[PDB]
Amino acid sequence: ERGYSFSLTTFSPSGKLVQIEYALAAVAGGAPSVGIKAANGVVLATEKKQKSILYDERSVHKVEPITKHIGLVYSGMGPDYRVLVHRARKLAQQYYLVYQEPIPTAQLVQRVASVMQEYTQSGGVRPFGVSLLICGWNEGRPYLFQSDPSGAYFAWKATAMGKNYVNGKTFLEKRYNEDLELEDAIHTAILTLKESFEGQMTEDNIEVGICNEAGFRRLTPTEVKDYLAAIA
Amino acid sequence: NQYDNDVTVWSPQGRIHQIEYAMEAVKQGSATVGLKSKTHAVLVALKRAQSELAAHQKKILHVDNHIGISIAGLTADARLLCNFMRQECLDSRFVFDRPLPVSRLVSLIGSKTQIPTQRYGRRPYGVGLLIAGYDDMGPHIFQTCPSANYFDCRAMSIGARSQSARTYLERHMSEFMECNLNELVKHGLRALRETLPAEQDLTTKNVSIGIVGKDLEFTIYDDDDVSPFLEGLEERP
Amino acid sequence: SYDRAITVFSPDGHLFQVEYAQEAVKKGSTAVGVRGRDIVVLGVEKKSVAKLQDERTVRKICALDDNVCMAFAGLTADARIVINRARVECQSHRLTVEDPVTVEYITRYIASLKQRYTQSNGRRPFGISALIVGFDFDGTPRLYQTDPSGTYHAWKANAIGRGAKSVREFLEKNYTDEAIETDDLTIKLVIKALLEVVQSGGKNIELAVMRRDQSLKILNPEEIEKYVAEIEKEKEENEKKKQ
Amino acid sequence: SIMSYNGGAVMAMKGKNCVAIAADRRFGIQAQMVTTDFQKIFPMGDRLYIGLAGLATDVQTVAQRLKFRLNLYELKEGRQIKPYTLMSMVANLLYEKRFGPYYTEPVIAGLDPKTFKPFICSLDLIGCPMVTDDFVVSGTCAEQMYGMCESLWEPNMDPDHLFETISQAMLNAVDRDAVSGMGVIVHIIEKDKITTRTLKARMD
Amino acid sequence: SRRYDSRTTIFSPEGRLYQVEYAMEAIGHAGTCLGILANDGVLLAAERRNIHKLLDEVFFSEKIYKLNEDMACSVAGITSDANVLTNELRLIAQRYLLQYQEPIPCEQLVTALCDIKQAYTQFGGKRPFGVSLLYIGWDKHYGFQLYQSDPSGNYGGWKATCIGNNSAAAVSMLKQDYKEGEMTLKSALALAIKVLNKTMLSAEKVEIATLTRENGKTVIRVLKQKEVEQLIKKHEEEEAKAEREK
Amino acid sequence: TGYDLSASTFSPDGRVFQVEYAMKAVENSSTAIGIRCKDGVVFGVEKLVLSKLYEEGSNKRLFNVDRHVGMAVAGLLADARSLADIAREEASNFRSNFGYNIPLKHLADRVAMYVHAYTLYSAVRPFGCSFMLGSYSVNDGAQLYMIDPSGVSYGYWGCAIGKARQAAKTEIEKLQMKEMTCRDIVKEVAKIIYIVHDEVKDKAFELELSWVGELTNGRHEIVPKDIREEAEKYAKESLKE
Amino acid sequence: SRGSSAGFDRHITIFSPEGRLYQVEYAFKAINQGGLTSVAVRGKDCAVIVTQKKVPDKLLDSSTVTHLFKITENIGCVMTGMTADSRSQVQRARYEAANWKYKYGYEIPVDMLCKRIADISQVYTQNAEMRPLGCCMILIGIDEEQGPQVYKCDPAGYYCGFKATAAGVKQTESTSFLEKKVKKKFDWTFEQTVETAITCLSTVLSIDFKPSEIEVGVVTVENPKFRILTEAEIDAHLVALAER
Amino acid sequence: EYDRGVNTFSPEGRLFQVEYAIEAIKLGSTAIGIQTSEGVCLAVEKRITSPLMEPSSIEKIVEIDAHIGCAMSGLIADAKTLIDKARVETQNHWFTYNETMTVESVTQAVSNLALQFGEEDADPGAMSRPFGVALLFGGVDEKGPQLFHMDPSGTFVQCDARAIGSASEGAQSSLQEVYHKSMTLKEAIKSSLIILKQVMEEKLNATNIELATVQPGQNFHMFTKEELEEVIKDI
């Protein structure tokens, strides 16, 4: 077969693209994720609860590096996220090949959001069922972006996604402060996750990445263990 | 119903309704009979006139010196298939400098007409064919169907009311092999006449004949050229 | 690509998509054409005159070449597409034949484009009807009409769009050899035909004229108002004659 | 030989907190002069210029396509391009025609949009970039320009001294080349201003 | 497959294109954008909908996009569709500049984009773009210009217009407040502030861009928070005096 | 209920009903049986004769797909001929690329994957035929495979497809085919075909016999006429008593 | 809502009002149609896959009825669900691994092969014209750095590494049993891992296996090549299990 | 409706779209062709819809070639592609073989397009539906005068006299009542005009009908208003 040529996302009489709203419902049912932009870096945190202890929790990561200076996390459907991660890495490399410079975070976000938009209008496909938090560092500045299934993107100082993200956003509003440093941001992000977390959090229950001048990196379970011991 | 609009939809009974509807297309057409002896293959086609002032639609076509066909069903599909068959015979003569054997032509027709029965948006060919041919294995009568199945027949009849012709052919087939050409054509004409209603009768206007044989290239007889074959025909019961 | 059959026959032998395109045409503002002896006049109902709109940008009368112009009724964007295609074709005809197009030639081209869009996969019909007026190189004035189905005819005078039935009935009662003896009377016939339908006055009317050997000339609102005043004078004087 | 068809010469030079870019003005076809005001240096930013020598048609085409790409880049990114990024963009453009190459060898000269640091570079016709700290040259009289620059260039020149150095280099180099000259144009790019001058030059 | 096909580009029994009407319904709920043409410039004023306290500002503006040296636009409707269309607009402008080595006249850019939109309404079986655009620009043929386009591919030039939420009330206000041929940039900004106040203001909730000519060059500028705050305060005291006088 | 119209749609129970419907088409066909013995493979088919007008041998359901590989079919005959053409192309292409006779298991896998490709899409419908492939080689022995409309391929010692597959399987299970020759197996195949044939419903039928084994030197061919006459005599004698 | 539906969301892979993909869930249900169950257990220096073997007809050639496949000399897999879907997926995995070695010059890691197959599956879940495959793949192999590796991919495009896992009808009970076993301890020897896998299968089915009712495949750090056990070895394991 | 593809057979063995297109033919203006030994005469009611319309712009009889004319009925806009194909066919035949195409061959080439419509496995330029027009090809070749009828189904037949369009029933009955094989071209022209006058609604006059003839001597000839007036006067 060849793919269907007609769009599966169309306007409703009320003016809504209901498939986009349904993909957003899928996103809202995902595992909670949090991003905080500090003065000197960005922290991405996400709940990483496995169904059972049989799962090798250290085999699949939710916090992924796109480039030395760009990482991302998601809420929603994992396989869709893998697709978008692969596309984002390809786009960043293409930018680097043309301009011989690491792609700016905003440019990467715009290109990925363009792909996501394409999946709301092309024939015979559904939208991606994920929302992305993209963190980056360039021009001596940290960047935190969110990109939605519709292909719309926003710049955030702090935000929460996934299950219970409205309470998370209220909590971040109360706690967030532009002047706080990166370690305080990590503490605040873990606290935000704790609000909507079921059971005890361990270094194997959550995943954390940080972006700063040195670059983006996923934190190790030992570092997360130290931060959790401090949080208690 | 929900199973009877596309060729790619199996019904819960294991049938494909669109193919059966194309079969109906064939069953609507005017009767045609094919039969053979040890040396000859004969097609006799009853031609219809849409109006008393219109010519009767041609039912027998040339394909190659050794192959002719009689059509029943949609005539445009018949022309498509006839053009394909003609091209196949031309390709055989061009490449191998020999006439295409009749059975291989029928196999090619089968593949060609089976392809659309499995693809979305396509339809079956709405024509049945009687194929009269002569090759190294002697004379041949083949019947091809919209279902893309084909049959090798001692004799056959297709089209409206062709069951009567088939009854006659079943009754008399024992005599066909040892028939001379004239007796063979007369048997074909009697079989075809069995399809006619009481009011209608075989004439030189609504009958066409096609003959192929060892020393006889496929020849189509129409109008007064049919009178010699009709002359010896008795009166129907 | 997308290859659905959009325009298909219905049981009664009707192409519903073509009929619905003609409904869309009937929703458009009325356009009127009159074929004079030395002048062809096009008028269009400038419906819902918004004081803030830049009228130059929403003109429903346009030029296809130096000797052919067009008015339309229906979907404006489809009309823009068709007009651009026709302009390209007019230039191609100049290039290959080394002469200007006849009005009939480009009319045939547009009608063929429309018919093609009623019989090709993955496309809906154009929702516009067109009045094409012009002068052939030998000087004959020409007025043609095309509709979404791709059929076209020549007319002495015609109307399209909403209220085209009443306007056509008025033109039947008013198109005479006397009524087109002069350019003024041809223009006034077009203005009267539009006034039979337009909401009020000449404010809601855009008028263009093509004279032999000259290019498309748009009548400015002052000229239209003067013509409307003359028409009102004639109406009052003739009604006084009747009384 | 294809790049000698029209002649021409461009040169760029680095000062202390300034750059200079210069070009000859002749547009000719082989031995015949056609005009004496042909543009070979094109602005690409407030403080960023590209000079193009070689075949005149390719000079114009490359300048125009580069402006296309740069305009789109600056709209999409919302910022002025840095000199190194422009060099990479030009290299990509030229290499795209690796087997059908444009016959021009650009030089770039500018200041960093945020730091105002001097930058110069040169590219071969298929886009190999070469960043240097003193000077680059391109065109038919490259050897003459190399001699003049190797002899006259000094580090940390102020704008007036840079002007005199690049001017003397260009004038004396083109005076020994038949198909380059008919005037010289010089742009001095500083933090606060761009000074454009045309020199008194031999017109034979 | 025929069963699942939405049939986006077909007429309805009354001669309507339902997907286009629904897209216009979508635009009706988007953020308000208004354009006003004056003798010495043209302005766009857009209501910001991204007003959450934790949002960061990193860009030139939220809803106003520069299209080329002489042209900018505002978009109401689906944001990602708008990004697609703004990229296409920039590409069209640059293609024109490459071919002719002059900036594209504003109406030509608008027509080129509306052709794409109209194409999406006539064939291909795709949903149309759910975007309406206001364009402001300057060219040498017609000077300062303001255009509007909608998902159907229709477009028109305006002296003042509004798209998005409460566009009808804003249009009524402009009809009763715009002085044809007698508008300056200053009075245009005052009128924009008044109209946005009615169809809704505070500085952080609106972005305003002006387009003017200075020394034969086009200047496109987004007013900073200081200028917008001053305009809002000027409108507030003007309204206070008007109320007191009565 | 709407779930059974396309092969690209799972029912809520995880079934693909279009494939099951194609299998029903197979089930409404006259039976064919293949039997693997020590020396080779024997195929028998109960070709129903739908009218005396047809020449003997019309609508054959045994095909040569390669010198060493025979194929017996049940279901939609046109689909079966299409699959036979596919199998022939696969064997010829394999010989062209690798320079030797395609192993039967590999050919069966390739054709089964071709069949499977038609079970995934709304663009096409599943094949309406099941078929057996038989081969014998010195290096590989005797091999018998069966493929069904879903694309499932399995090797067998005895296989029956068609409307009387279960009764034919019950009869086949009574033979110790692993220690028999093709010469006795042809008689047993004829007997089974005659047993399972429904004399009332099915009217008349021709017995089609083919085999491939040591006695044919690895070439698949129709059973010689005298052998078939002996086998049919034995089958009729077994029926009458 | 709960189990709500709009438009065609039950027939093609478009989101339901809840954000679900019903066709993917139906493919998961199709996995159980085969009626079989497989288990995989990761030891200290070995990985083992056990699976039910069913041959209801004595006319079937039992050698040809298997669910264990070599993907590469060092990578083996057990497939669960619709057989033809499984065979197509095995063909695709073999192609991916051979292409990987051809393009990069070293053998594909198990995790990367599982990711590639899962990406193909994900594509099936976003394009409406084809259905997802109704099968689940469990891969085992020895990675030179990580040691033994057990990975699973499913029709949703979701994959993961596991200490132990199961697929098929008795997946949930198998996972409960294995969860208890790994909780008590995880550092198993080769014999211990094989016996744990066999006991999981036997307990969930409640059968005591004859050698011919199950299939076993193993990779070990000593012999990383994927090996399918013979009825002799299986019977040795079964007797060593019964005696204890 | 879209519940079916354009290539769907009905339970009676007919393509739905072709039957609907034939229904469309039954809405066209009436045309009548008569074949005699001295030539072929085609006639067609113009069906003027408004006195403001120009009757000369209604082209229902067109020249395919000097020796072939075509009358049409139904959706006339659809006929343009078929007419152009016929014209290009005759000119290709002349270019290749240096001879004139027979009427039957031209009719066959046109009829080969009737069923060339479909949606899937169709490249752009493919027709989405059948042509809704019926054609009467009249001509003169080596076999004398020839009249052929083609309908949307691709079936074409030679006819002595045929009526197509809305009133084709009564017209055909009258043609059967009046036609004999020995009639002269003048007789055929008079009879066709009488039948048209009978089945038409507007009064038959020289402006609201079209009449052409093909003869072995003269080429395809369209009657002028004065010739039409002369023929009509004797009715």
Author numbering:
A (entry chain B): 3 to 234
B (entry chain F): 4 to 240
C (entry chain D): 2 to 244
D (entry chain J): 2 to 205
E (entry chain C): 2 to 201, 206 to 251
F (entry chain G): 6 to 246
G (entry chain A): 2 to 245
H (entry chain E): 7 to 241
Cite, word for word, the article reporting this structure.
The proteasome of the malaria parasite Plasmodium falciparum (Pf20S) is an advantageous drug target because its inhibition kills P. falciparum in multiple stages of its life cycle and synergizes with artemisinins. We recently developed a macrocyclic peptide, TDI-8304, that is highly selective for Pf20S over human proteasomes and is potent in vitro and in vivo against P. falciparum.
To experimentally determine the selective mechanism against the human proteasome, we solved a cryo-EM structure of human c-20S in complex with TDI-8304 (c-20S-TDI-8304). The cryo-EM map was refined to an average resolution of 2.0 Å. The atomic model shows that TDI-8304 is in the β5 pockets, and no extra density was observed in the β2 pockets nor the antechambers. In the β5 pocket, TDI-8304 binds in an antiparallel binding mode, which is consistent with the computationally docked model. However, the steric hindrance from Pro126 of c-20S β6 forces the P5 pyrrolidinone group of TDI-8304 to flip downwards and toward the cyclic ring, resulting in a loss of two hydrogen bonds from pyrrolidinone compared with TDI-8304 in the β5 of the Pf20S wild type. Based on our analysis of the TDI-8304 binding in the Pf20S β5 site with high affinity and in the Pf20S β2 and c-20S β5 sites with low affinity, we suggest that the two hydrogen bonds between pyrrolidinone of TDI-8304 and Ser154 of Pf20S β6 play a pivotal role in driving the high-affinity binding of TDI-8304 to the Pf20S β5 pocket. These potential steric conflicts may lower the inhibitor binding affinity in the β5 catalytic pockets of c-20S and i-20S, explaining the lack of inhibition of the human proteasomes.
